[PDB]
Write a protein that binds this DNA or RNA. Sequence first.
RNA 1: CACCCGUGCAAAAAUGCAGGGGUCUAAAACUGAGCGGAUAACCUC
RNA 2: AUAGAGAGGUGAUCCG
Length: 831
Amino acid sequence: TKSMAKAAGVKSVFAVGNTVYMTSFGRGNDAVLEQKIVDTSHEPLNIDDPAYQLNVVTMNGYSVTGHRGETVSAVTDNPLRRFNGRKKDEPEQSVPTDMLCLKPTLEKKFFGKEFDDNIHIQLIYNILDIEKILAVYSTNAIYALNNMSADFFMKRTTDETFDDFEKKKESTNSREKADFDAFEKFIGNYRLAYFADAFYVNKKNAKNVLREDKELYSVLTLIGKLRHWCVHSEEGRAEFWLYKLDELKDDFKNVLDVVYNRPVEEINNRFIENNKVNIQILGSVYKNTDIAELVRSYYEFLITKKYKNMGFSIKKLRESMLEGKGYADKEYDSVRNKLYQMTDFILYTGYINEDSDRADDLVNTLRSSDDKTTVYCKEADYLWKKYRESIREVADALDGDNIKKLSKSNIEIQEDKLRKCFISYADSVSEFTKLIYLLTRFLSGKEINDLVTTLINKFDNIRSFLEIMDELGLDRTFTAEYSFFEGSTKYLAELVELNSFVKSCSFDINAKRTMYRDALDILGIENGLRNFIASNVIDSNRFKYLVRYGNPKKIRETAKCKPAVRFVLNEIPDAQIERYYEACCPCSANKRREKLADMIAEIKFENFSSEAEIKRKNQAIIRLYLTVMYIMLKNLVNVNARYVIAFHCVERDTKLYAESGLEVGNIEKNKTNLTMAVMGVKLENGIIKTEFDKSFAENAANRYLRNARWYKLILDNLKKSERAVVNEFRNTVCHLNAIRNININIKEIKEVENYFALYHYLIQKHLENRFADKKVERDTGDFISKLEEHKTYCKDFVKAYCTPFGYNLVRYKNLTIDGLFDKNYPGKDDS
RNA sequence: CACCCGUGCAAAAAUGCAGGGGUCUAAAACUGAGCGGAUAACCUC
RNA sequence: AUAGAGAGGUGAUCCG
Ligand SMILES: [Mg+2]
């Protein structure tokens, strides 16, 4: 269940020295200081509108009741008593540390000094989360540019201007000429038609053509170094690269500007023309406000998407206040779409113009409160009794073409302003945001939303912590290398602006004559009907993902692996399966899937042979085959993203512990060194000769491995691991070779229980293929033998090569025990 | 059906009841996840 | 000269 303390409004419980501070929820993510406690003595800080009050205060707990929404009573634990409770021989009361014991080093890196409080560590961890998510969504981008090859993108740095790169053409060193020849080969690929916004430009003659060679190199280099910086841990001045993007060479800035300006120029030029009808009608019904200001407000409402960020579902509000009314009838379907939207502005302006005060009641009652529906019903009730006359007037203002059309050929505009208050061009947006947009040209669909939303959340959290620290009187002055975060408010605004217009995709150019072959190969076809299948397969949203992150001919072969297809169809609900079968073949639920899996695997041209039903049949078959293939590839890529997180964390924590004084060894040649440094064990003659003892458990470097049980399990697993196996596992995960060779690695599978099993079977088979020609250790040989015998992923083998993540117990258990892996498909623990 | 911590009852190294964790994990809370199911709309093939 | 289908924007709709 949700935390009762958060229901009462206790946002956070900070600790500063011998004092503990409690905060409440303000507007949005802002925080308001409420109470301060000094050893059972308390003095409230917010008096104008308290969110909660303390009833009984003891050294080991604080009791609250809350005043807003449901009066829910709750108890909060004193942060100063953490790790200092009963059975600990009554230790002193002190400020807590993070589980990795990296709080002193992390604070000394981002700030100049150690701090006696726990506010700064949360800001540092949010920055770490930003880097973590950038690693995931950057390693996927380079994979897209690697896939089209059917190396260069590694070790590509931003201190090499294209004026220098061209000199490499006649260079006598073969290792450099091969690097240049890789670039020459890359730009001639027809698959560069995909990711159009990053490599193609529009010009009059008008048609789309490739950019110049200079601009293409800048895009590849910028994305290339983003991966290298966000996966490796650079040494020297290069480690602050993302936070010092103002120092880039002129070529990289110009390409970023040109890429960023295209959508902002498209949208901002059509605003008046595309929305003229709505503006005039809204100004007719809202004539009390000046037209010049009023049209500016509508820019905030729709173009900037401000009306959806208010903290509650305005969609639900409108749905609940338009209950059972005649103007919403289907007989006005030609108006209903606009009637809702013009009602939405009437809704949005209310909580800003006049009734801004009482939006707090709605945003707080919902939080303190499933039974949350009646809150919407009550709130929607007042909405009608006030806005009935207003929205009914709009309901007839839109009536008839006499206004829905006369609003266009009137051709009257204010036209007086100099195009101000719009979305900013490239000259005003910071370089950090412009690099995010370039990264999003290569991701697809939900990934864009995930990345942008996560970035917005983390930056907002950083801003809230900074404001709290300003209120408390603490020092926040970042080090000179990290001045990037001082203006976090500015970077938040640009990302919120970006989320409004980012297209979540990049539409391909009008050169689909080349995509004909790929679209035919994805079905294994290779007259007249062929062009129809090509036209339908292309422009299907699920085909865009398949041809970017996969190879068309390889995808068809994996459709022949029956268990992989059968598992995907089981995830589709029973109602949907019935719909497909009704269209695909004009019975038992289980048997319906079996017949469907037979047809999707053996799809041929002959299967595609009045005419209306046959046209509809082929549309269903294409939609089904692409849907199944999209689901399997998406899940495998997302699972592989979980391990790039783990390896990024390993390579970051290695350097973090290096500064703390713990000897770690060279992480490159053996990736299990970090977990050996934490447990205080050292390799000797290639094996761990130190047996288990309770003394080593107590002297562990971090709190995770002070668990007596889990030290033994990890130590037992390290003995079974091998250096080469872990290195090849690292190489496979970061370059996504497990998905690149889905053609071979999935051939002999027997049963797929979840996407965890399917993913780890692909990696283990790849490891078998890689080491079949070389000597292996006895444990690896036993694991390979078990894999061959059972034809399913060996559970013990997973615990072997996932050992470099052992220093973080939670991450180790999540990435080695099935069921604890995915939060959407929970399962029982197996340890 | 993950990890850590506090508290109370039972126990010699541990069990249970009840809580907290933006400082545990992709993981604090407020717009139930939408990843499936298509309609009139301006414009495109 | 005329007739296809997916796109920024909203109803539909099932899921725990
Ligand atoms: Mg966190």
